Write an enzyme that holds these catalytic residues in place. Structure first.
Site, PDB file in Angstrom:
ATOM      1  N   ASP A  46       0.641  -0.936  -0.262  1.00 26.11           N
ATOM      2  CA  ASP A  46      -0.003   0.074   0.076  1.00 26.11           C
ATOM      3  C   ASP A  46       0.678   1.339  -0.158  1.00 26.11           C
ATOM      4  OD1 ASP A  46      -1.438   2.000   1.642  1.00 26.11           O
ATOM      5  OD2 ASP A  46      -2.751   1.050   0.908  1.00 26.11           O
ATOM      6  N   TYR A  51       3.513   9.381  -0.737  1.00 23.17           N
ATOM      7  CA  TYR A  51       4.331   9.638  -0.192  1.00 23.17           C
ATOM      8  C   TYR A  51       5.842   9.304  -0.780  1.00 23.17           C
ATOM      9  CZ  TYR A  51       0.125   6.233   2.754  1.00 23.17           C
ATOM     10  OH  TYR A  51      -0.517   5.740   3.171  1.00 23.17           O
ATOM     11  N   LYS A  76      -2.610   5.666  -4.776  1.00 28.03           N
ATOM     12  CA  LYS A  76      -3.911   6.638  -4.278  1.00 28.03           C
ATOM     13  C   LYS A  76      -3.510   8.020  -4.727  1.00 28.03           C
ATOM     14  CE  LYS A  76      -3.341   4.513   0.803  1.00 28.03           C
ATOM     15  NZ  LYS A  76      -2.213   4.411   0.875  1.00 28.03           N
ATOM     16  N   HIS A 109      -7.270   9.848  -1.486  1.00 21.38           N
ATOM     17  CA  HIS A 109      -6.477   9.542  -0.752  1.00 21.38           C
ATOM     18  C   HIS A 109      -7.592  10.445   0.618  1.00 21.38           C
ATOM     19  CE1 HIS A 109      -2.445   9.477   1.581  1.00 21.38           C
ATOM     20  NE2 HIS A 109      -3.496   9.115   2.345  1.00 21.38           N
ATOM     21  N   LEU A 193      -0.133   4.581  15.854  1.00 22.85           N
ATOM     22  CA  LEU A 193       0.942   4.785  15.393  1.00 22.85           C
ATOM     23  C   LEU A 193       1.234   4.823  17.098  1.00 22.85           C
ATOM     24  CD1 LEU A 193       0.073   8.602  14.806  1.00 22.85           C
ATOM     25  CD2 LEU A 193       1.158   6.929  13.346  1.00 22.85           C
ATOM     26  N   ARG A 231       2.275  -0.874   9.651  1.00 17.93           N
ATOM     27  CA  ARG A 231       2.097   0.771   9.447  1.00 17.93           C
ATOM     28  C   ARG A 231       3.205   0.715   9.111  1.00 17.93           C
ATOM     29  NH1 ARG A 231       3.158   6.307  10.659  1.00 17.93           N
ATOM     30  NH2 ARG A 231       2.539   7.302   9.179  1.00 17.93           N
ATOM     31  N   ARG A 267      -4.506  10.771  13.687  1.00 21.96           N
ATOM     32  CA  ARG A 267      -4.392  11.408  11.716  1.00 21.96           C
ATOM     33  C   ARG A 267      -5.660  12.748  11.672  1.00 21.96           C
ATOM     34  NH1 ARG A 267       0.113  10.308  11.283  1.00 21.96           N
ATOM     35  NH2 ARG A 267       0.372  10.410   9.284  1.00 21.96           N
TER      36      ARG A 267
HETATM   37 CL   LIG Z   1      -0.170   2.249  13.777  1.00 20.93          CL
END
Ligand SMILES: [Cl-]
Length: 276
Positions: A46, A51, A76, A109, A193, A231, A267
């Protein structure tokens, strides 16, 4: 051989329920993370225009020896590229950077309501799909109402809605809304995170199952019926992160993780965010 089962999308394509995201990884980090993931059987990768690392993803795919049809590649569409014509151009540019003839999934996105272009972006992406550039199309960070606007105005329902989802923000309502529209929920930031890795409820459950906190968090997410993106996993972690199909969290522990829900969003806010 693949290390995760697949879920069937509303366009009859199949998608691995667990994959690797490469947000915020450097080019070298991206190549190494993708290579490590593919080596232990991960088959979904992904990435995104935003990015800055699609070419690095492309290099790792090219070197992997894994047949293209066995890979599921997601990328995306960034908000500045939203538009009927521009989003088609953006799709082709992503393909070029990836060194691929098609992607398996192309996502808007962010809806970016203040920009107000996401319905026209979707219109373009429908053409990208018709031309074979994207085999499935979907969205990220969309609300139920955002998705209903797409259906009402373009007659095409997203295959996937990729949203922030973890025990602090378990997205119960949006999960149900996605399902009601035949949209697969794909979770990102499943560890908040990292903020949940030392959560006492999480670590207590991890100890009980003799698993890591991340394994508990990933398994919980999968047991909700979500697809999940790990992630930006380091090579040293990815095999551990994928070892989540040989145990099951009992109801009392699913309930305990359910009790952590408190609306903590780590986020950006889908309602207002207009950046990349
Ligand atoms: Cl995460």
């Amino acid at each position: 051989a693949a290390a995760a089962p697949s879920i069937t999308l509303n366009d009859e394509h199949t998608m691995p329920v667990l994959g690797l995201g490469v947000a915020e990884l450097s080019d070298d980090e991206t190549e190494r993370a993708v290579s490590a993931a593919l080596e232990i059987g991960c088959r979904l990768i992904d990435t995104a225009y935003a990015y800055g690392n699609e070419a690095a993803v492309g290099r790792a795919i090219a070197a992997s020896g894994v047949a293209r049809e066995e890979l599921f590649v997601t990328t995306k569409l960034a908000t500045p590229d939203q538009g009927f014509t521009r989003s088609q151009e953006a799709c082709r540019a992503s393909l070029d950077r990836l060194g691929l003839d098609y992607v398996d999934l192309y996502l808007i996105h962010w809806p970016a309501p203040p920009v107000g272009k996401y319905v026209d972006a979707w219109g373009g992406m429908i053409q990208s799909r018709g031309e074979g550039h994207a085999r499935s199309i979907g969205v990220s960070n969309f609300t139920a109402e955002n998705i209903e606007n797409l259906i009402d105005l373009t007659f095409v329902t997203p295959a996937v809605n990729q949203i922030e989802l973890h025990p602090l923000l378990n997205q119960d309502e949006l999960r149900k809304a996605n399902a009601q529209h035949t949209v697969v929920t794909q979770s990102y930031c499943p560890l908040a995170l990292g903020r949940l890795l030392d959560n006492p409820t999480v670590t207590s459950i991890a100890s009980e199952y003799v698993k890591t906190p991340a394994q508990v968090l990933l398994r919980w997410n999968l047991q909700l019926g979500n697809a999940v993106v790990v992630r930006s996993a380091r090579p040293e972690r990815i095999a551990s992160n994928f070892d989540v199909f040989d145990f099951e969290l009992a109801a009392e522990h699913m309930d305990a993780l359910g009790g952590l829900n408190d609306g903590t969003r780590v986020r950006e806010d889908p309602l207002t965010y207009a950046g990349t």
